[PDB]
Amino acid sequence: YEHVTVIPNTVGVPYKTLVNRPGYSPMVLEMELLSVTLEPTLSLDYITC
Amino acid sequence: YEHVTVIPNTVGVPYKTLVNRPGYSPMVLEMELLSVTLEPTLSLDYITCEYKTVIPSPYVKCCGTAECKDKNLPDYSCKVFTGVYPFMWGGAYCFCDAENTQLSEAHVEKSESCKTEFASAYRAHTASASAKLRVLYQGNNITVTAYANGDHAVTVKDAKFIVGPMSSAWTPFDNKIVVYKGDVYNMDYPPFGAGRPGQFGDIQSRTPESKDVYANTQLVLQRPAAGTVHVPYSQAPSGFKYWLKERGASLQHTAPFGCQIATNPVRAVNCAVGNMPISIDIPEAAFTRVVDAPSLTDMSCEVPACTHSSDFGGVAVIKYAASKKGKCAVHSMTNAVTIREAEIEVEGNSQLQISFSTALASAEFRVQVCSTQVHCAAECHPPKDHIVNYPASHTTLGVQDISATAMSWVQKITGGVGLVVAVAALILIVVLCVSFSRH
Ligand SMILES: *[C@@H]1O[C@H](CO)[C@@H](O[C@@H]2O[C@H](CO)[C@@H](O[C@@H]3O[C@H](CO)[C@@H](O)[C@H](O[C@H]4O[C@H](CO)[C@@H](O)[C@H](O)[C@@H]4O[C@@H]4O[C@H](CO)[C@@H](O)[C@H](O)[C@H]4NC(C)=O)[C@@H]3O)[C@H](O)[C@H]2NC(C)=O)[C@H](O)[C@H]1NC(C)=O
Ligand SMILES: *[C@@H]1O[C@H](CO)[C@@H](O[C@@H]2O[C@H](CO)[C@@H](O[C@@H]3O[C@H](CO)[C@@H](O)[C@H](O[C@H]4O[C@H](CO)[C@@H](O)[C@H](O)[C@@H]4O)[C@@H]3O)[C@H](O)[C@H]2NC(C)=O)[C@H](O)[C@H]1NC(C)=O
Ligand SMILES: *[C@@H]1O[C@H](CO[C@@H]2O[C@@H](C)[C@@H](O)[C@@H](O)[C@@H]2O)[C@@H](O[C@@H]2O[C@H](CO)[C@@H](O[C@@H]3O[C@H](CO)[C@@H](O)[C@H](O)[C@@H]3O)[C@H](O)[C@H]2NC(C)=O)[C@H](O)[C@H]1NC(C)=O
Known part of the structure; x- marks a missing residue:
């Protein structure tokens, strides 16, 4: 499953995205x-x- | 017992048949x-x-x-x-x-x-x-x-x-x-x-x-x-x-x-090509009486996930209150969805999980767990894969049946059209009655 997101370029602030694949439990990814x-x-x- | 049935000739696709002998527990036969x-x-x-x-x-x-x-x-x-x-x-x-x-x-x-x-x-x-x-x-x-x-x-x-x-x-x-x-x-x-x-x-x-x-x-x-x-x-x-x-x-x-x-x-x-008529003489020993077989009540169904992926992409959970420990036979009351399992174990108040395959965009069916029909319905999602190496485990599309339960747009638009038609027809009837009354 390919998930595409956009994050602001600010350094040191984590952002969280919801990978929602139907038929599966939601997943949350924090990237900094x-x-x-x-x-x-x-x-x-x-x-x- | 003599049971006659017809199964399509496709090789490698199991098919479910109801042996429904009145006075005895329903039986499900899988033939492939x-x-x-x-x-x-x-x-x-x-x-x-x-x-x-x-x-x-x-x-x-x-x-x-x-x-x-x-x-x-x-x-x-x-x-x-x-x-x-x-x-x-x-x-x-x-x-x-x-x-x-x-x-x-x-x-x-x-x-x-x-x-x-x-x-x-x-x-x-x-x-x-x-x-x-x-x-x-x-x-x-x-x-x-x-x-x-x-x-x-x-x-x-x-x-x-x-x-x-x-x-x-x-x-x-x-x-x-x-x-x-x-x-x-x-x-x-x-x-x-x-x-x-x-x-x-x-x-x-x-x-x-x-x-x-x-x-x-x-x-x-x-x-x-x-x-x-x-x-x-x-x-x-x-x-x-x-x-x-x-x-x-x-x-x-x-x-x-x-x-x-x-x-x-x-x-x-x-x-x-074609299909096969199959007749089975079933020994009477295989049957179980309705009163002897367990009876389930106060049962509900929920579908956590549904995907018409042709490999049993849907899974349902049925909460049941069983009269006693025993074996029953789950069967779907509609052709659009097919259940992988033929028999579940039941005990007291618990839940059982079933797998099913369909082509419906919105699953709406009634599972007959054991002489008891529970209505189960939920949204279904399309699979991301385009091609698979196995034949579709579910049945054909069916005409107008697979209309997703967001066709309330069709009902609402046809209702608006019928509303304008009814208002116009009421107007026409009123004026016709008035004109006929006038001499
Ligand atoms: C004390 O500390 C200072 C700071 O480090 C030192 O200064 C350094 O000195 C080094 C030695 O001269 C420098 O390193 C190289 O020196 C080469 C001498 O010939 C010089 O040619 C180098 O420049 C080329 O390479 C660089 C890195 O690859 C390139 O960025 C640069 O553009 C050059 O590359 C050529 O570019 C032309 C563009 O037209 C091309 O046509 C060529 O094809 C390119 N050739 C290659 C091979 O890429 C480089 O300067 C070092 O740079 C320098 N420090 C800094 C910060 O610049 C002192 O020496 C030190 N004291 C003592 C006593 O050593
Ligand atoms: C090489 O391998 C091939 C296949 O792997 C094999 O081909 C077969 O050859 C025999 C001839 O010896 C054909 O006939 C068969 O031989 C048995 C011997 O036990 C006979 O009983 C049968 O022959 C009669 O069958 C006809 C059917 O109506 C009769 O009408 C007629 O009178 C024949 O005498 C039996 O058919 C056999 O049909 C072929 N097999 C195929 C698929 O074509 C061959 O024998 C092997 N050996 C050599 C040296 O090539
Ligand atoms: C009765 O037979 C059915 C199907 O018939 C089977 O056909 C072949 C595959 C051979 O295994 C035959 O020996 C056999 O009779 C059985 O259903 C199938 O059981 C197998 C068990 O190995 C299932 O394979 C598993 O599949 C899961 C999910 O993909 C994997 O994680 C496992 O690793 C394993 O590979 C197969 O899916 C299943 N097919 C169905 C349900 O359609 C059945 O178990 C058997 N029952 C008894 C009591 O003998």
Whole structure:
């Protein structure tokens, strides 16, 4: 079963979603973003000193 | 007790029947067809195989003219060629340089391989249907095997079974069939003694060991090349070999209704066509009186989950207050839902769990647990899977029955339309009465 959800990008706040599969008991998933890293790809122009 | 019933021919799908003998506890019988075999009666028309051309050594008559006589061999051809001057390895065969003749004779015989590699051309007649059936009799699995012709009753555990006759006489085998090793083909083979060259049946014989061989291979002797002693001929190649290369697909892969085809003997197995009348003579000992069997009251039903997935996707819980410990037989009072279990144990005030399969979008049925009918209804959900490897365990859709119990939209819209119709008709009646009154 594939469950699709959306969570705000705020770090350290858990959000809970209800996976409701008919014929089965409801399931609750708590997910928390511990760290989101944006690493840009760098092309070195030059060096100054 | 004599119970007559009809079950569809689908193999591997159990079917539930109510034995309702008044004054005794209702009984539920589960019957499942394990194998249905149609074995047609075959009369061997003939045998086709590969032929061999027998060519005795040619007769070189030089300084003279040769001649031959007609023979009664299957396809005998003889000829005399004039003006031949054959050579051997040491030189010319003989002196006289012209007016020499060569006698070439050849015939067609069935090869020894006809004993092993051959195709049997048969005619088909009525089929002797047979059946193997598994019955859940009083919690015990019993197996019966009987000819499905309305006769040949079989008694197991003092219960007598009569099966058939077939509700449909359809068989995958037509009048004329051909069996090679294990493949059965439907073809209109040529009549014996009228075979055509290069096709199936160019050489024919009544039985593999028979010496009567009919051959039509269009065998024409040709003039030998100058200076050689060979015996050339123009003969249509074996029709049996060409058929072997050009067989196509047999009945095992092209039979309708999913029939399987076997040989030795030729059998059609598991043809899901028609249905089967089954009559059971039940011993009186198997029955239990109504007063002796437990009675249940104050019972309710709830469906935690329902999915029309065709593998008993619905589960129901029935709370019961049993009069005493005993065995009863759960049965559904409607065709749309089918229950996996046939008998539950009951004791005091408790609950029992049942499994069921259906095609309804909203299950609404009445389960007869034990001489007591409880109404059970709940929402059902579609399964996420698209294809499965087993046949649907429930019944067909049924016309207008599977309307989900949210069709209250249909009732409300038709009620509004009927309301405007009734108001308009009331207006028309009022004005008509007023106009008739006015003069
Ligand atoms: C004290 O501490 C400081 C801080 O760390 C040190 O500074 C570091 O010094 C290192 C040594 O010079 C630096 O490491 C590398 O030095 C290479 C020398 O040739 C230089 O070429 C490197 O740059 C390439 O690699 C990087 C990482 O892969 C890339 O990000 C960078 O863009 C370069 O990559 C090329 O980019 C061009 C773009 O046009 C491409 O065309 C090429 O194909 C790319 N090539 C490759 C192989 O990717 C890199 O600088 C180190 O960077 C530097 N620290 C920092 C933070 O920059 C001091 O040295 C130290 N003191 C002592 C005494 O050592
Ligand atoms: C190789 O294997 C194949 C199959 O696995 C096998 O084919 C069978 O050949 C026999 C010939 O020996 C066919 O005839 C059968 O032989 C028994 C011997 O006990 C006979 O009783 C029968 O022959 C009669 O059957 C006809 C039915 O009406 C008679 O009309 C006729 O007079 C025959 O004499 C019995 O049929 C047999 O039919 C085939 N089987 C099939 C499915 O075609 C073969 O024998 C094996 N051996 C060799 C060396 O190839
Ligand atoms: C009477 O026979 C029925 C069915 O007949 C059976 O057919 C074959 C499968 C062979 O097992 C035969 O020996 C046998 O007679 C029995 O019902 C079936 O029982 C089996 C038990 O092995 C069930 O298989 C189980 O299925 C569950 C759920 O899928 C699995 O978790 C298990 O691991 C196991 O595989 C099968 O589902 C069931 N079929 C039904 C109910 O339609 C019946 O048990 C038997 N009863 C007696 C008293 O002999």
